[PDB]
Amino acid sequence: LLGEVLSEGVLTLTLGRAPAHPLSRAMIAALHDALRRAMGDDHVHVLVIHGPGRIFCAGHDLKEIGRHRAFVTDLFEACSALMLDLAHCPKPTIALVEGIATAAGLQLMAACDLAYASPAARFCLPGVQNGGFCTTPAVAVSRVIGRRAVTEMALTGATYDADWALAAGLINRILPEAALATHVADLAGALAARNQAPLRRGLETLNRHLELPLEQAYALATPVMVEHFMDPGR
Amino acid sequence: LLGEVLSEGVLTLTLGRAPAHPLSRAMIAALHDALRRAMGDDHVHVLVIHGPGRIFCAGHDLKEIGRDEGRAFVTDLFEACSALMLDLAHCPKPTIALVEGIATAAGLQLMAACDLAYASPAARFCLPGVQNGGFCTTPAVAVSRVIGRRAVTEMALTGATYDADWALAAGLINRILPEAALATHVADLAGALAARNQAPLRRGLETLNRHLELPLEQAYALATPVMVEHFM
Amino acid sequence: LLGEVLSEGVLTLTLGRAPAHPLSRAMIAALHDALRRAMGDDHVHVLVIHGPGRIFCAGHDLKEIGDEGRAFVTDLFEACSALMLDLAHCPKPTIALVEGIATAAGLQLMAACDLAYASPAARFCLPGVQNGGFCTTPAVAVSRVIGRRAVTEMALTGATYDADWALAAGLINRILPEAALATHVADLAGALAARNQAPLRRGLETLNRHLELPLEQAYALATPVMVEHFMDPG
After folding, report:
1. Which Gene3D superfamilies match (chain C) (predicted)?
2. CATH of domain A194-234
3. Which fold has domain B196-231?
4. CB under 8 Å to B102, separation ≥6 — which residues?
5. Which of A6, B11, B216, C201 could crosslink C91 through cysteines, CB 3.0-4.6 Å?
């Protein structure tokens, strides 16, 4: 269950299944279908992922399949395929967080390019308390915060506030909850209003070079910089 | 020497040779020997490294009075040090550093190689390599994986001493806790970590360490079957 | 124009063409020539890149030679990248002295230095998207200096950020009062110049090399270098 609304190039993905907004197998498929269509639609310029209320996203719902593995293997491989596609998405992805982002719910947020929270927003990786470990969510989280920060979240399973998240680089800015909706809408709207071709090529190049050494990064980046200056929309 | 006490899965390694706790060839061998025994013992779940007093660890015993005008000894010492620190960082079991004072050179490295680190306000951090006419190359390795590029470069080049507040911002330490509550928080946290389900904890930490050294797609290829193993 | 004054092993490179200090084809060639010399002169121990005034560096000179201008722009960016890579890998310590606004390729120049000090007035920006483009090459040096989300927000929004944000993001090492900054940089640079130079240069290039390698390979590289320090006369 997903709500989709397009307004001036901005596509807002409003996560259903209130209040926990769980990443069930059907939710992951719905989120991936919405993304495959968005990346192929010229009308969609920017993506906004909103999990409304008290909980941004609780992660996968602890549902029961017990016959024979095959379900959990399908679940995680599809979840990883979504998170990969979302982080490597050429078009800007923004997460609007008003509450708690836990487990795979923190991953969804961490996989977005930008993340804006209200002061009441809490962040967690609770695996150790449930007799597990958040291996897959720590992949996307480890890319946005320092090695000490992710190690403490994963090992202790504690809930962290918005202030710690701002200082760690988990979110971009903390805004009062009445201003959060407008801030994201204006920021996304302005992003949608710029010359698109250099934006997508620029974001794609940025993601690719962060996994390359300095020398190869400049080899990739330089011709991409020439192309921006040769663009008719400059 | 190296005092080692075990509780409910919490092995606390107390550094000897007070007050500076120098990382001598003997100390390096003792720390590596203690780590080896701890990794193959089911009863040891979490490791707590502690250097009590005003100094956490001075890093490398200045007994470089060696023979190869010191060369063979110096090569042996640094290879054994890198072998210990590499195995400490890549330890499947959680390692915590309890800091009450000054962590210098290889001592700051020892702290950096740990999965977690907790300090008191009086705790100081430094890479003094330039003062003696050298450079903290090996200690800079573990420190560079824990703090930002500009931060490592400043510690290394200036050789200055930094306080606890700077170390928290740079991500060198996890949290600052008062002297009266430090030794209890680390013990409580270590106990909490030792009481959790052990198999998915070690398999998850082992995976976090190696996926951090991989590109996104490859990290997701290694992590997904491990995440399946957790739930089973 | 580029002014250079050597004193106590510290070569302060003062950017000319005030107030903007544009990184024109001439300025890039002058900065590269000033870098090649010094790198080959034992008398130069520490480098200081200065850009006096309200502006540190505006970035590239916005003059487009319009058949196309492609075979000029390609030569500009290639040479810009050749300088920034050379500057980042330079074994001799490089320090930026920022007191004003460092924007576009000007922020790149700053980010490529080993250390950077600023006054509380100093501003930082990547305005690419405002002019219908994207700061792709400047983002390369900046992304090796600040975290994932901080660089993503700078490039996508194009907004300007203050010194406090730069300190927190790690873009600059320390904020100093306006009437103390120049002397703090001169006292620090002088202290590095008086240090035993061989292990300093050897240790700096090794640090930059191992940060692009996994842990095991990082130690295989670093360990013999540490043995070389202890065998050096000093």
Report:
1. 1.10.287.2460, 2-enoyl-CoA Hydratase, Chain A, domain 1
2. 1.10.287.2460
3. Helix Hairpins (1.10.287)
4. B54, B55, B56, B123, B124, B125, B126, B161
5. C201
Burial letters C114-143, b for 16+ CB under 10 A, else e: bbbbbbeebbbbbbbbebbbbbbbbbbbbb
Among candidate residues C230, C140, C20, the one with its CA nearest the CA of residue B106: C230
Question: In sequence order, which ranges of C50-126 are alpha helices (DSSP H)?
Answer: 70-89, 105-111
Interface test with B, best of A71, A89, A136, A211 (most B CBs within 10 A): A136
Look up residue A60 and give its DSSP letter.
S
Q: Nearest 10 degrees: CA dihedral of B137, B141, B144, B150?
A: 20
Within 8 A of A224 by CB-CB distance, chain C residues are 136
C170 SS3 class: coil
How close A66 gets to chain C, by Cα (Å)? Answer: 40
Which secondary structure element, helix H or strand E, spans residue B26, and what is its range? helix B25-39
Cβ distance C19 to C101 under 8 Å? no
CATH 1.10.10.60, domain C195-234, yes or no: no
SS3 category, C35 = helix
In Å, what resolution does this model reach?
Answer: 2.3
Taking the CA atoms of residue B48, residue B49, residue B50 and residue B55 in that order, the dihedral angle to the nearest 10 degrees is -150
Residues of C in contact with A169 (CB under 8 A): 147-150
- On whether the CB atoms of residues B39 and B93 are closer than 8 A, the answer is yes
Sheet of B161-162, strand order: B55-57, B102-104, B124-126, B161-162
Fold of B1-195: 2-enoyl-CoA Hydratase; Chain A, domain 1 (3.90.226)
The arrangement of secondary structure in C1-194, i.e. its CATH architecture, is: Alpha-Beta Complex (3.90)
Q: How far apart are CA C92 and CA C76, in angstroms?
A: 25
Structure tokens at B136: 């903290």
Q: Is the peptide bond preceding residue B94 cis, with omega within 30 degrees of 0? A: no
Residues of B in contact with C165 (CB under 8 A): none
Where do we find the tokens 């000033």? C34
Residues of A with CB under 8 A from a CB of B: 69, 72-73, 76-77, 80, 83-84, 87-88, 127-129, 131-136, 138-139, 142-143, 146-152, 154-156, 167, 211
